[PDB]
A paper describes a structure:
Surprisingly, this construct yielded almost exclusively dimers, of which we obtained a 4.6-Å structure. Each molecule in the dimer has the same conformation we observed in the monomer; however, the ANK domain is fully resolved in the dimer structure. Surprisingly, despite the similarities in their domain organization and the structures of the monomers, the LRRK1 dimer bears no resemblance to that of LRRK2. In contrast to LRRK2, whose dimer is mediated entirely by the COR-B domain in its RCKW moiety, the LRRK1 dimer shows minimal direct interactions between RCKWs; the only contact seen in our structure is a homotypic interaction involving residues 1,263–1,265 in the kinase N-lobe. Our structure suggests that the LRRK1 dimer uses the ANK domain to accomplish, in trans, the steric autoinhibition achieved by the LRR domain in the LRRK2 monomer.
LRRK1 and LRRK2 use different mechanisms of autoinhibition, with LRRK1 having a second level of autoinhibition absent in LRRK2.
Numbering used by the authors:
A (entry chain A): 51 to 244, 254 to 510, 539 to 620
B (entry chain B): 51 to 155
The structure:
Protein backbone atom coordinates (compact mmCIF):
# COMPACT_ATOMS: atom_id res chain seq x y z
CA UNK A 1 0.00 0.00 0.00
CA UNK A 2 2.85 2.37 0.87
CA UNK A 3 4.43 1.43 -2.48
CA UNK A 4 2.12 3.91 -4.24
CA UNK A 5 3.93 6.74 -2.45
CA UNK A 6 7.35 5.48 -3.52
CA UNK A 7 6.10 4.97 -7.06
CA UNK A 8 4.96 8.57 -7.31
CA UNK A 9 8.23 9.62 -5.69
CA UNK A 10 10.09 7.55 -8.28
CA UNK A 11 8.37 9.50 -11.05
CA UNK A 12 9.61 12.71 -9.43
CA UNK A 13 13.00 11.20 -8.59
CA UNK A 14 13.78 10.69 -12.29
CA UNK A 15 12.05 13.96 -13.23
CA UNK A 16 9.01 12.27 -14.81
CA UNK A 17 6.37 14.79 -13.81
CA UNK A 18 3.64 13.44 -16.10
CA UNK A 19 4.14 9.91 -14.86
CA UNK A 20 4.03 11.40 -11.38
CA UNK A 21 0.67 12.97 -12.28
CA UNK A 22 -0.72 9.63 -13.44
CA UNK A 23 0.53 7.74 -10.37
CA UNK A 24 -0.75 10.55 -8.14
CA UNK A 25 -4.25 10.34 -9.61
CA UNK A 26 -4.22 6.55 -9.20
CA UNK A 27 -3.16 6.86 -5.56
CA UNK A 28 -5.71 9.61 -4.86
CA UNK A 29 -8.40 7.25 -6.10
CA UNK A 30 -6.87 4.53 -3.90
CA UNK A 31 -6.04 6.89 -0.98
CA UNK A 32 -9.32 7.54 0.83
CA UNK A 33 -7.95 8.32 4.30
CA UNK A 34 -6.97 11.87 5.22
CA UNK A 35 -3.41 10.94 6.20
CA UNK A 36 -2.73 9.23 2.87
CA UNK A 37 -4.13 12.19 0.91
CA UNK A 38 -2.00 14.54 2.99
CA UNK A 39 1.07 12.47 2.21
CA UNK A 40 0.18 12.55 -1.50
CA UNK A 41 -0.05 16.34 -1.25
CA UNK A 42 3.28 16.42 0.61
CA UNK A 43 5.10 14.57 -2.20
CA UNK A 44 4.93 17.32 -4.89
CA UNK A 45 5.18 20.07 -2.26
CA UNK A 46 8.45 18.60 -0.99
CA UNK A 47 9.55 18.11 -4.60
CA UNK A 48 8.41 21.62 -5.53
CA UNK A 49 5.78 20.80 -8.19
CA UNK A 50 3.49 23.74 -7.48
CA UNK A 51 1.21 22.83 -10.40
CA UNK A 52 0.35 19.40 -9.01
CA UNK A 53 -0.21 20.88 -5.54
CA UNK A 54 -2.64 23.31 -7.18
CA UNK A 55 -4.39 20.44 -8.97
CA UNK A 56 -4.71 18.42 -5.76
CA UNK A 57 -6.07 21.38 -3.79
CA UNK A 58 -8.45 22.48 -6.57
CA UNK A 59 -9.68 19.25 -8.18
CA UNK A 60 -9.04 16.46 -5.66
CA UNK A 61 -9.86 18.91 -2.83
CA UNK A 62 -7.19 17.28 -0.68
CA UNK A 63 -7.40 18.27 2.98
CA UNK A 64 -4.42 20.14 4.44
CA UNK A 65 -3.73 18.93 8.01
CA UNK A 66 -2.89 21.50 10.69
CA UNK A 67 -0.48 19.22 12.58
CA UNK A 68 2.83 21.09 13.15
CA UNK A 69 4.93 18.17 11.91
CA UNK A 70 7.69 17.70 9.34
CA UNK A 71 5.22 15.49 7.44
CA UNK A 72 2.87 18.42 6.80
CA UNK A 73 2.91 19.55 3.13
CA UNK A 74 3.25 23.22 4.08
CA UNK A 75 6.04 22.45 6.56
CA UNK A 76 8.06 20.64 3.89
CA UNK A 77 7.24 23.40 1.40
CA UNK A 78 8.78 25.88 3.84
CA UNK A 79 11.62 23.41 4.43
CA UNK A 80 12.84 23.72 0.83
CA UNK A 81 12.02 27.43 0.48
CA UNK A 82 9.26 26.94 -2.12
CA UNK A 83 7.40 30.15 -1.30
CA UNK A 84 4.78 29.72 -4.03
CA UNK A 85 3.86 26.26 -2.75
CA UNK A 86 3.76 27.54 0.84
CA UNK A 87 1.30 30.31 -0.02
CA UNK A 88 -0.76 27.97 -2.22
CA UNK A 89 -1.10 25.47 0.62
CA UNK A 90 -1.77 28.09 3.30
CA UNK A 91 -4.56 29.61 1.20
CA UNK A 92 -6.40 26.27 1.35
CA UNK A 93 -6.70 26.29 5.16
CA UNK A 94 -10.43 26.59 5.99
CA UNK A 95 -12.26 28.38 8.75
CA UNK A 96 -11.54 31.52 10.77
CA UNK A 97 -9.24 29.96 13.40
CA UNK A 98 -6.07 30.29 11.37
CA UNK A 99 -3.80 27.52 12.74
CA UNK A 100 -1.10 29.75 14.19
CA UNK A 101 0.71 26.74 15.70
CA UNK A 102 1.62 25.38 12.27
CA UNK A 103 2.65 28.89 11.20
CA UNK A 104 5.09 29.32 14.11
CA UNK A 105 6.50 25.85 13.50
CA UNK A 106 7.22 26.50 9.83
CA UNK A 107 8.37 30.05 10.65
CA UNK A 108 11.08 28.78 12.98
CA UNK A 109 11.91 26.06 10.46
CA UNK A 110 12.43 28.68 7.75
CA UNK A 111 14.50 30.85 10.09
CA UNK A 112 16.73 27.87 10.88
CA UNK A 113 16.97 26.94 7.19
CA UNK A 114 17.60 30.48 5.93
CA UNK A 115 14.63 30.78 3.53
CA UNK A 116 14.09 34.49 4.06
CA UNK A 117 11.16 34.75 1.65
CA UNK A 118 9.18 32.11 3.53
CA UNK A 119 9.83 33.89 6.84
CA UNK A 120 8.76 37.21 5.31
CA UNK A 121 5.52 35.84 3.85
CA UNK A 122 4.68 33.96 7.05
CA UNK A 123 5.22 36.86 9.45
CA UNK A 124 3.85 39.67 7.26
CA UNK A 125 0.98 38.03 5.33
CA UNK A 126 -0.24 35.28 7.69
CA UNK A 127 0.67 37.00 10.96
CA UNK A 128 2.93 34.33 12.42
CA UNK A 129 4.21 35.48 15.81
CA UNK A 130 7.92 36.47 15.69
CA UNK A 131 8.10 36.33 19.51
CA UNK A 132 6.38 33.01 20.37
CA UNK A 133 7.80 29.47 20.45
CA UNK A 134 7.76 26.98 17.57
CA UNK A 135 6.96 24.24 20.08
CA UNK A 136 5.20 21.04 19.05
CA UNK A 137 3.47 18.47 21.23
CA UNK A 138 5.92 16.65 23.50
CA UNK A 139 8.35 19.53 22.92
CA UNK A 140 9.45 22.35 25.22
CA UNK A 141 9.33 26.11 24.43
CA UNK A 142 13.10 26.55 24.18
CA UNK A 143 14.69 29.68 22.73
CA UNK A 144 16.02 27.51 19.89
CA UNK A 145 12.39 27.39 18.71
CA UNK A 146 12.17 31.21 18.83
CA UNK A 147 12.59 32.61 15.28
CA UNK A 148 14.88 35.59 15.95
CA UNK A 149 17.25 33.50 18.07
CA UNK A 150 17.24 30.67 15.53
CA UNK A 151 17.89 33.17 12.74
CA UNK A 152 20.87 34.89 14.37
CA UNK A 153 22.43 31.75 15.90
CA UNK A 154 22.17 30.00 12.52
CA UNK A 155 24.15 32.86 10.94
CA UNK A 156 21.12 34.14 9.00
CA UNK A 157 21.69 37.76 9.97
CA UNK A 158 19.33 39.16 7.32
CA UNK A 159 16.33 37.20 8.60
CA UNK A 160 17.10 38.19 12.19
CA UNK A 161 17.34 41.91 11.44
CA UNK A 162 14.19 41.65 9.33
CA UNK A 163 12.36 40.10 12.29
CA UNK A 164 13.69 42.83 14.58
CA UNK A 165 12.49 45.54 12.19
CA UNK A 166 9.11 43.77 11.85
CA UNK A 167 8.13 43.11 15.48
CA UNK A 168 10.81 40.99 17.16
CA UNK A 169 12.55 42.07 20.36
CA UNK A 170 15.90 41.57 22.05
CA UNK A 171 16.17 39.78 25.39
CA UNK A 172 18.78 38.79 27.96
CA UNK A 173 19.44 35.42 26.32
CA UNK A 174 20.31 36.97 22.94
CA UNK A 175 22.83 39.42 24.38
CA UNK A 176 24.38 36.95 26.83
CA UNK A 177 24.62 33.96 24.48
CA UNK A 178 25.56 35.72 21.20
CA UNK A 179 26.96 39.09 22.33
CA UNK A 180 29.13 39.48 19.22
CA UNK A 181 26.38 39.43 16.54
CA UNK A 182 23.92 41.05 18.97
CA UNK A 183 26.22 44.04 19.49
CA UNK A 184 26.93 44.03 15.75
CA UNK A 185 23.23 44.45 14.99
CA UNK A 186 22.82 47.07 17.72
CA UNK A 187 25.90 48.93 16.46
CA UNK A 188 24.87 48.78 12.78
CA UNK A 189 21.15 48.72 12.03
CA UNK A 190 19.89 51.25 14.60
CA UNK A 191 22.47 53.96 13.79
CA UNK A 192 21.64 57.24 12.04
CA UNK A 193 25.08 58.76 11.53
CA UNK A 194 25.44 62.52 11.93
CA UNK A 195 30.55 61.18 15.27
CA UNK A 196 27.27 62.77 16.52
CA UNK A 197 25.23 59.64 15.88
CA UNK A 198 21.49 59.26 16.50
CA UNK A 199 20.95 55.70 17.73
CA UNK A 200 17.40 54.46 18.33
CA UNK A 201 17.46 51.37 20.57
CA UNK A 202 13.96 52.06 21.88
CA UNK A 203 11.07 49.61 21.42
CA UNK A 204 13.53 46.71 21.84
CA UNK A 205 12.59 45.59 25.40
CA UNK A 206 16.24 45.66 26.41
CA UNK A 207 16.46 44.61 30.09
CA UNK A 208 19.92 46.20 30.40
CA UNK A 209 22.49 48.17 28.41
CA UNK A 210 26.29 48.17 28.59
CA UNK A 211 28.97 50.76 27.93
CA UNK A 212 30.65 48.03 25.87
CA UNK A 213 27.99 48.46 23.18
CA UNK A 214 28.74 52.05 22.07
CA UNK A 215 30.94 53.89 24.62
CA UNK A 216 33.80 53.76 22.10
CA UNK A 217 31.98 56.50 20.13
CA UNK A 218 31.31 58.64 23.22
CA UNK A 219 33.48 61.33 21.58
CA UNK A 220 30.32 63.10 20.40
CA UNK A 221 27.23 60.87 20.79
CA UNK A 222 26.70 57.18 21.53
CA UNK A 223 22.90 56.99 21.67
CA UNK A 224 19.88 59.21 22.33
CA UNK A 225 16.73 57.05 22.57
CA UNK A 226 16.68 54.25 25.16
CA UNK A 227 12.95 54.43 25.91
CA UNK A 228 10.13 51.90 25.52
CA UNK A 229 11.87 48.94 27.14
CA UNK A 230 12.23 47.12 30.48
CA UNK A 231 15.34 48.87 31.81
CA UNK A 232 15.66 49.00 35.61
CA UNK A 233 19.17 50.50 35.96
CA UNK A 234 21.68 52.47 33.90
CA UNK A 235 25.41 53.18 33.92
CA UNK A 236 26.10 56.71 35.14
CA UNK A 237 27.73 57.40 31.77
CA UNK A 238 24.26 57.31 30.22
CA UNK A 239 23.15 60.29 32.37
CA UNK A 240 26.31 62.40 32.11
CA UNK A 241 29.37 60.51 30.82
CA UNK A 242 28.83 61.47 27.16
CA UNK A 243 30.11 64.67 25.61
CA UNK A 244 27.98 66.11 22.78
CA UNK A 245 24.52 64.73 23.50
CA UNK A 246 21.65 67.13 22.82
CA UNK A 247 18.61 64.96 23.63
CA UNK A 248 18.13 61.86 25.78
CA UNK A 249 14.96 59.75 25.97
CA UNK A 250 15.08 57.61 29.12
CA UNK A 251 11.30 57.26 29.50
CA UNK A 252 8.81 54.36 29.47
CA UNK A 253 10.84 51.81 31.41
CA UNK A 254 11.38 50.44 34.94
CA UNK A 255 13.97 53.11 35.82
CA UNK A 256 12.87 53.84 39.37
CA UNK A 257 16.21 55.52 40.10
CA UNK A 258 18.74 57.36 37.92
CA UNK A 259 22.48 57.53 38.73
CA UNK A 260 23.42 60.72 40.55
CA UNK A 261 26.53 62.86 40.95
CA UNK A 262 28.50 64.34 43.83
CA UNK A 263 29.30 67.56 41.95
CA UNK A 264 29.36 69.16 38.52
CA UNK A 265 32.87 67.73 38.05
CA UNK A 266 31.32 64.29 37.42
CA UNK A 267 29.11 65.67 34.61
CA UNK A 268 30.52 65.46 31.09
CA UNK A 269 27.16 65.91 29.29
CA UNK A 270 27.09 69.68 29.67
CA UNK A 271 25.41 70.13 26.25
CA UNK A 272 22.08 68.41 26.96
CA UNK A 273 19.16 70.45 25.60
CA UNK A 274 16.22 68.17 26.41
CA UNK A 275 15.56 65.12 28.59
CA UNK A 276 12.62 62.69 28.66
CA UNK A 277 12.34 60.57 31.83
CA UNK A 278 8.56 60.30 32.01
CA UNK A 279 6.52 57.11 32.44
CA UNK A 280 9.01 55.80 35.01
CA UNK A 281 8.95 55.04 38.77
CA UNK A 282 10.84 58.08 40.05
CA UNK A 283 10.21 59.54 43.51
CA UNK A 284 12.71 62.39 43.06
CA UNK A 285 15.05 63.64 40.36
CA UNK A 286 18.85 63.56 40.84
CA UNK A 287 20.54 66.89 41.66
CA UNK A 288 22.78 66.54 38.59
CA UNK A 289 20.07 68.23 36.54
CA UNK A 290 20.75 71.30 38.71
CA UNK A 291 24.13 71.67 36.93
CA UNK A 292 22.79 71.73 33.33
CA UNK A 293 22.48 75.47 32.74
CA UNK A 294 21.87 74.82 29.02
CA UNK A 295 19.05 72.29 29.43
CA UNK A 296 15.95 73.61 27.65
CA UNK A 297 13.32 70.92 28.39
CA UNK A 298 12.66 68.53 31.27
CA UNK A 299 9.65 66.18 31.18
CA UNK A 300 9.39 63.88 34.21
CA UNK A 301 5.63 63.31 34.28
CA UNK A 302 3.82 59.98 34.66
CA UNK A 303 5.99 59.25 37.70
CA UNK A 304 5.57 58.75 41.47
CA UNK A 305 7.38 61.96 42.40
CA UNK A 306 7.04 63.34 45.91
CA UNK A 307 9.42 66.25 45.24
CA UNK A 308 11.16 67.79 42.25
CA UNK A 309 14.57 67.55 43.95
CA UNK A 310 16.01 66.55 47.29
CA UNK A 311 16.23 69.42 49.75
CA UNK A 312 19.59 70.85 48.64
CA UNK A 313 18.91 74.32 50.05
CA UNK A 314 22.59 75.25 50.41
CA UNK A 315 24.27 74.49 47.08
CA UNK A 316 24.93 77.11 44.38
CA UNK A 317 22.70 75.55 41.74
CA UNK A 318 23.14 77.00 38.24
CA UNK A 319 21.46 74.30 36.17
CA UNK A 320 17.96 74.62 34.74
CA UNK A 321 18.40 78.41 34.75
CA UNK A 322 17.62 78.48 31.02
CA UNK A 323 14.96 75.76 31.21
CA UNK A 324 11.92 76.71 29.12
CA UNK A 325 9.67 73.68 29.75
CA UNK A 326 9.06 71.77 32.99
CA UNK A 327 6.38 69.06 32.74
CA UNK A 328 6.06 67.22 36.07
CA UNK A 329 2.33 66.47 36.01
CA UNK A 330 0.82 63.09 36.94
CA UNK A 331 2.74 62.95 40.21
CA UNK A 332 2.14 63.10 43.97
CA UNK A 333 3.55 66.54 44.82
CA UNK A 334 1.88 68.51 47.61
CA UNK A 335 4.47 71.32 47.74
CA UNK A 336 6.65 73.02 45.12
CA UNK A 337 9.36 74.73 47.23
CA UNK A 338 10.33 78.23 46.15
CA UNK A 339 14.03 77.28 46.23
CA UNK A 340 14.32 75.23 43.05
CA UNK A 341 11.35 76.91 41.35
CA UNK A 342 12.78 80.40 41.83
CA UNK A 343 16.16 79.15 40.59
CA UNK A 344 14.50 79.08 37.14
CA UNK A 345 14.67 82.15 34.89
CA UNK A 346 13.66 81.15 31.34
CA UNK A 347 10.64 78.92 32.05
CA UNK A 348 7.62 79.64 29.86
CA UNK A 349 5.57 76.42 30.09
CA UNK A 350 4.83 74.88 33.51
CA UNK A 351 2.66 71.75 33.58
CA UNK A 352 2.04 70.76 37.21
CA UNK A 353 -1.55 69.58 36.86
CA UNK A 354 -2.79 66.29 38.32
CA UNK A 355 -0.89 66.50 41.60
CA UNK A 356 -1.66 66.69 45.32
CA UNK A 357 -0.82 70.41 45.34
CA UNK A 358 -2.78 72.57 47.78
CA UNK A 359 -0.93 75.91 47.52
CA UNK A 360 0.17 77.33 44.18
CA UNK A 361 3.96 77.93 44.37
CA UNK A 362 5.09 81.36 45.53
CA UNK A 363 5.41 83.25 42.22
CA UNK A 364 8.41 85.06 40.79
CA UNK A 365 9.45 87.17 37.79
CA UNK A 366 9.66 84.55 35.03
CA UNK A 367 7.83 84.77 31.68
CA UNK A 368 5.24 82.00 31.92
CA UNK A 369 3.22 81.94 28.70
CA UNK A 370 1.10 78.98 29.87
CA UNK A 371 0.46 77.18 33.15
CA UNK A 372 -1.58 74.04 33.86
CA UNK A 373 -2.19 73.16 37.51
CA UNK A 374 -5.71 71.72 37.33
CA UNK A 375 -6.71 68.40 38.90
CA UNK A 376 -5.17 69.51 42.20
CA UNK A 377 -6.32 70.55 45.69
CA UNK A 378 -5.42 74.21 45.14
CA UNK A 379 -7.18 76.51 47.61
CA UNK A 380 -6.14 79.87 46.13
CA UNK A 381 -3.78 81.71 43.80
CA UNK A 382 -1.13 84.35 44.57
CA UNK A 383 -1.82 88.05 44.11
CA UNK A 384 1.47 88.69 42.26
CA UNK A 385 0.28 87.33 38.89
CA UNK A 386 -0.28 90.87 37.60
CA UNK A 387 3.20 91.72 38.95
CA UNK A 388 5.08 89.14 36.86
CA UNK A 389 2.94 87.65 34.07
CA UNK A 390 0.76 90.64 33.13
CA UNK A 391 2.12 90.54 29.55
CA UNK A 392 3.17 86.87 29.21
CA UNK A 393 0.62 84.31 30.41
CA UNK A 394 -1.92 83.35 27.73
CA UNK A 395 -3.22 79.91 28.83
CA UNK A 396 -4.29 79.16 32.41
CA UNK A 397 -5.86 75.93 33.70
CA UNK A 398 -6.44 76.00 37.47
CA UNK A 399 -9.79 74.21 37.21
CA UNK A 400 -10.96 71.10 39.08
CA UNK A 401 -9.51 72.19 42.44
CA UNK A 402 -10.54 73.04 46.01
CA UNK A 403 -10.39 76.77 45.24
CA UNK A 404 -12.96 79.24 46.61
CA UNK A 405 -12.00 82.66 45.19
CA UNK A 406 -9.75 83.84 42.34
CA UNK A 407 -7.92 87.10 43.18
CA UNK A 408 -8.10 90.06 40.81
CA UNK A 409 -4.57 89.46 39.52
CA UNK A 410 -5.43 86.63 37.14
CA UNK A 411 -8.08 88.89 35.58
CA UNK A 412 -5.75 91.90 35.71
CA UNK A 413 -3.53 90.09 33.20
CA UNK A 414 -3.36 91.38 29.63
CA UNK A 415 -1.90 88.49 27.62
CA UNK A 416 -4.31 86.06 29.31
CA UNK A 417 -6.93 84.81 26.85
CA UNK A 418 -7.47 81.07 27.60
CA UNK A 419 -9.12 80.50 30.99
CA UNK A 420 -10.21 77.12 32.38
CA UNK A 421 -11.55 77.92 35.85
CA UNK A 422 -14.24 75.27 36.42
CA UNK A 423 -14.53 72.51 39.01
CA UNK A 424 -14.14 74.87 41.97
CA UNK A 425 -16.21 76.35 44.80
CA UNK A 426 -16.12 79.94 43.53
CA UNK A 427 -19.39 81.85 43.90
CA UNK A 428 -18.44 85.50 43.25
CA UNK A 429 -16.13 87.30 40.82
CA UNK A 430 -14.13 90.52 41.08
CA UNK A 431 -15.97 93.56 39.67
CA UNK A 432 -15.90 93.71 35.87
CA UNK A 433 -14.38 97.22 35.88
CA UNK A 434 -11.18 95.69 37.30
CA UNK A 435 -10.94 93.13 34.46
CA UNK A 436 -8.25 93.93 31.88
CA UNK A 437 -8.35 90.61 29.98
CA UNK A 438 -9.13 92.38 26.71
CA UNK A 439 -7.80 89.51 24.57
CA UNK A 440 -10.14 86.97 26.19
CA UNK A 441 -11.56 84.42 23.74
CA UNK A 442 -12.69 81.44 25.85
CA UNK A 443 -13.94 81.61 29.45
CA UNK A 444 -14.92 78.30 31.08
CA UNK A 445 -16.63 79.40 34.30
CA UNK A 446 -18.87 76.34 34.70
CA UNK A 447 -19.13 73.79 37.52
CA UNK A 448 -19.08 76.12 40.51
CA UNK A 449 -21.37 77.86 43.01
CA UNK A 450 -21.73 81.09 41.01
CA UNK A 451 -25.22 82.58 40.92
CA UNK A 452 -24.43 88.34 39.59
CA UNK A 453 -21.85 87.75 36.85
CA UNK A 454 -20.72 90.87 34.98
CA UNK A 455 -18.48 91.35 31.94
CA UNK A 456 -16.51 94.21 30.41
CA UNK A 457 -18.23 95.59 27.32
CA UNK A 458 -15.01 95.04 25.34
CA UNK A 459 -15.67 91.28 25.41
CA UNK A 460 -18.50 92.11 22.99
CA UNK A 461 -15.83 91.68 20.28
CA UNK A 462 -13.54 89.15 21.99
CA UNK A 463 -15.27 86.07 23.43
CA UNK A 464 -16.02 83.19 21.07
CA UNK A 465 -17.17 80.67 23.70
CA UNK A 466 -18.61 81.10 27.20
CA UNK A 467 -19.43 78.17 29.51
CA UNK A 468 -21.82 78.70 32.42
CA UNK A 469 -23.71 75.42 32.69
CA UNK A 470 -24.05 73.44 35.93
CA UNK A 471 -24.07 76.43 38.28
CA UNK A 472 -26.36 78.00 40.89
CA UNK A 473 -28.14 80.01 38.20
CA UNK A 474 -31.80 80.94 38.65
CA UNK A 475 -31.79 83.82 36.15
CA UNK A 476 -29.48 84.54 33.22
CA UNK A 477 -27.24 87.53 34.05
CA UNK A 478 -28.27 90.42 31.77
CA UNK A 479 -24.60 91.13 30.97
CA UNK A 480 -24.75 88.27 28.44
CA UNK A 481 -26.49 90.76 26.13
CA UNK A 482 -23.12 92.50 25.68
CA UNK A 483 -21.47 89.49 24.04
CA UNK A 484 -22.38 90.00 20.39
CA UNK A 485 -19.24 88.22 19.16
CA UNK A 486 -20.08 85.12 21.23
CA UNK A 487 -20.55 82.02 19.08
CA UNK A 488 -21.12 79.16 21.55
CA UNK A 489 -22.91 79.44 24.91
CA UNK A 490 -23.71 76.91 27.64
CA UNK A 491 -26.59 77.53 30.07
CA UNK A 492 -27.80 73.99 30.79
CA UNK A 493 -27.74 72.14 34.11
CA UNK A 494 -29.41 75.18 35.70
CA UNK A 495 -32.81 73.90 36.89
CA UNK A 496 -33.73 77.25 38.46
CA UNK A 497 -34.07 79.01 35.10
CA UNK A 498 -37.47 79.69 33.51
CA UNK A 499 -36.92 82.77 31.30
CA UNK A 500 -34.63 82.95 28.28
CA UNK A 501 -33.77 86.66 27.76
CA UNK A 502 -34.84 88.20 24.43
CA UNK A 503 -31.46 89.95 24.16
CA UNK A 504 -29.85 86.58 23.42
CA UNK A 505 -31.39 86.98 19.96
CA UNK A 506 -29.21 90.07 19.50
CA UNK A 507 -26.10 87.87 19.82
CA UNK A 508 -25.83 87.30 16.10
CA UNK A 509 -22.79 85.04 16.16
CA UNK A 510 -24.51 82.30 18.17
CA UNK A 511 -24.69 78.92 16.42
CA UNK A 512 -25.14 76.56 19.41
CA UNK A 513 -26.76 76.74 22.85
CA UNK A 514 -26.77 74.18 25.66
CA UNK A 515 -30.52 73.86 26.22
CA UNK A 516 -30.13 70.69 28.30
CA UNK A 517 -32.95 70.23 30.81
CA UNK A 518 -33.95 73.90 30.57
CA UNK A 519 -37.67 74.68 30.47
CA UNK A 520 -38.23 78.16 29.02
CA UNK A 521 -41.53 79.77 29.97
CA UNK A 522 -41.30 82.62 27.43
CA UNK A 523 -40.67 80.25 24.48
CA UNK A 524 -43.27 77.78 23.12
CA UNK A 525 -42.50 74.08 23.31
CA UNK A 526 -42.25 73.73 19.52
CA UNK A 527 -39.51 76.35 19.22
CA UNK A 528 -37.59 74.75 22.09
CA UNK A 529 -37.88 71.36 20.38
CA UNK A 530 -36.71 72.74 17.02
CA UNK A 531 -33.39 73.85 18.52
CA UNK A 532 -31.10 76.82 19.21
CA UNK A 533 -31.62 78.44 15.81
CA UNK B 1 -20.05 60.82 33.47
CA UNK B 2 -21.51 60.34 29.99
CA UNK B 3 -21.03 64.09 29.45
CA UNK B 4 -17.36 63.49 28.63
CA UNK B 5 -18.45 61.63 25.49
CA UNK B 6 -20.71 64.47 24.38
CA UNK B 7 -17.99 67.00 25.14
CA UNK B 8 -15.53 65.20 22.89
CA UNK B 9 -18.28 64.86 20.30
CA UNK B 10 -18.92 68.59 20.60
CA UNK B 11 -15.28 69.27 19.74
CA UNK B 12 -15.72 67.15 16.61
CA UNK B 13 -19.19 68.55 15.92
CA UNK B 14 -17.77 72.06 15.48
CA UNK B 15 -14.64 70.71 13.76
CA UNK B 16 -12.33 71.40 16.74
CA UNK B 17 -10.03 68.41 16.38
CA UNK B 18 -7.38 69.65 18.82
CA UNK B 19 -9.96 70.35 21.49
CA UNK B 20 -11.29 66.88 20.73
CA UNK B 21 -7.78 65.53 21.35
CA UNK B 22 -7.57 67.26 24.72
CA UNK B 23 -11.03 66.13 25.83
CA UNK B 24 -10.27 62.61 24.57
CA UNK B 25 -7.08 62.40 26.64
CA UNK B 26 -8.95 63.66 29.70
CA UNK B 27 -11.69 61.06 29.23
CA UNK B 28 -9.18 58.27 28.59
CA UNK B 29 -7.60 59.10 31.93
CA UNK B 30 -11.10 59.13 33.45
CA UNK B 31 -12.38 56.15 31.38
CA UNK B 32 -10.91 53.03 32.98
CA UNK B 33 -13.55 50.50 31.92
CA UNK B 34 -13.26 48.70 28.60
CA UNK B 35 -16.69 49.81 27.36
CA UNK B 36 -15.92 53.49 27.97
CA UNK B 37 -12.55 53.23 26.22
CA UNK B 38 -14.24 51.47 23.30
CA UNK B 39 -16.78 54.28 23.07
CA UNK B 40 -13.95 56.84 23.13
CA UNK B 41 -12.33 54.96 20.26
CA UNK B 42 -15.67 54.85 18.44
CA UNK B 43 -16.07 58.64 18.55
CA UNK B 44 -13.21 59.58 16.15
CA UNK B 45 -13.75 56.43 14.09
CA UNK B 46 -17.37 57.41 13.47
CA UNK B 47 -16.22 60.98 12.83
CA UNK B 48 -13.39 59.78 10.59
CA UNK B 49 -10.37 61.13 12.51
CA UNK B 50 -7.95 58.36 11.57
CA UNK B 51 -5.06 60.11 13.33
CA UNK B 52 -6.74 60.06 16.73
CA UNK B 53 -7.76 56.43 16.25
CA UNK B 54 -4.10 55.69 15.55
CA UNK B 55 -3.06 57.59 18.68
CA UNK B 56 -5.58 55.72 20.84
CA UNK B 57 -4.54 52.32 19.48
CA UNK B 58 -0.81 53.08 19.69
CA UNK B 59 -0.39 55.20 22.84
CA UNK B 60 -3.50 54.62 24.96
CA UNK B 61 -3.55 50.98 23.78
CA UNK B 62 -7.35 51.07 23.76
CA UNK B 63 -8.93 47.63 23.48
CA UNK B 64 -11.04 46.94 20.39
CA UNK B 65 -14.13 44.87 21.33
CA UNK B 66 -15.19 42.01 19.07
CA UNK B 67 -18.93 42.47 19.69
CA UNK B 68 -20.74 42.64 16.30
CA UNK B 69 -22.71 45.75 17.28
CA UNK B 70 -23.29 49.18 15.75
CA UNK B 71 -21.42 50.58 18.78
CA UNK B 72 -18.18 48.86 17.73
CA UNK B 73 -15.57 51.36 16.41
CA UNK B 74 -14.81 49.20 13.37
CA UNK B 75 -18.51 48.72 12.62
CA UNK B 76 -19.10 52.48 12.59
CA UNK B 77 -15.90 52.97 10.59
CA UNK B 78 -17.34 50.63 7.97
CA UNK B 79 -20.69 52.40 8.34
CA UNK B 80 -19.28 55.68 6.98
CA UNK B 81 -16.94 54.06 4.46
CA UNK B 82 -13.72 55.17 6.19
CA UNK B 83 -11.55 52.38 4.79
CA UNK B 84 -8.32 53.63 6.39
CA UNK B 85 -9.91 53.66 9.84
CA UNK B 86 -11.41 50.21 9.26
CA UNK B 87 -8.03 48.69 8.40
CA UNK B 88 -6.32 50.56 11.24
CA UNK B 89 -8.82 49.18 13.75
CA UNK B 90 -8.81 45.65 12.33
CA UNK B 91 -5.01 45.52 12.52
CA UNK B 92 -5.25 46.01 16.31
CA UNK B 93 -7.28 42.82 16.87
CA UNK B 94 -5.07 40.44 18.91
CA UNK B 95 -4.67 36.70 18.85
CA UNK B 96 -5.01 34.07 16.12
CA UNK B 97 -8.80 33.58 16.30
CA UNK B 98 -9.66 36.42 13.96
CA UNK B 99 -13.20 37.46 15.00
CA UNK B 100 -14.96 36.50 11.77
CA UNK B 101 -18.37 37.32 13.29
CA UNK B 102 -17.57 41.03 13.48
CA UNK B 103 -16.15 40.85 9.94
CA UNK B 104 -19.35 39.38 8.47
CA UNK B 105 -21.46 41.92 10.37
Amino acid sequence: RSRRTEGIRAAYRRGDRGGARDLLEEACDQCASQLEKGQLLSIPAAYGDLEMVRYLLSKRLVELPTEPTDDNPAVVAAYFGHTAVVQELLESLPGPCSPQRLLNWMLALACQRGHLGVVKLLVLTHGADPESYAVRKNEFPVIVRLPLYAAIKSGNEDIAIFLLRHGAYFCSYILLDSPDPSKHLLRKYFIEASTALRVKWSHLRLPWVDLDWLIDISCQITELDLSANCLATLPSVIPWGLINLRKLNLSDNHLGELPGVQSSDEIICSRLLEIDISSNKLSHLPPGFLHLSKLQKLTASKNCLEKLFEEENATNWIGLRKLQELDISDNKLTELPALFLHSFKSLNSLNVSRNNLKVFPDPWACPLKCCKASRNALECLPDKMAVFWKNHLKDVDFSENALKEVPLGLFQLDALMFLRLQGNQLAALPPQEKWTCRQLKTLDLSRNQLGVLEFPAFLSESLEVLCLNDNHLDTVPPSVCLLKSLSELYLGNNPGLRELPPELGQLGNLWQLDTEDLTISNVPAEIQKEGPK
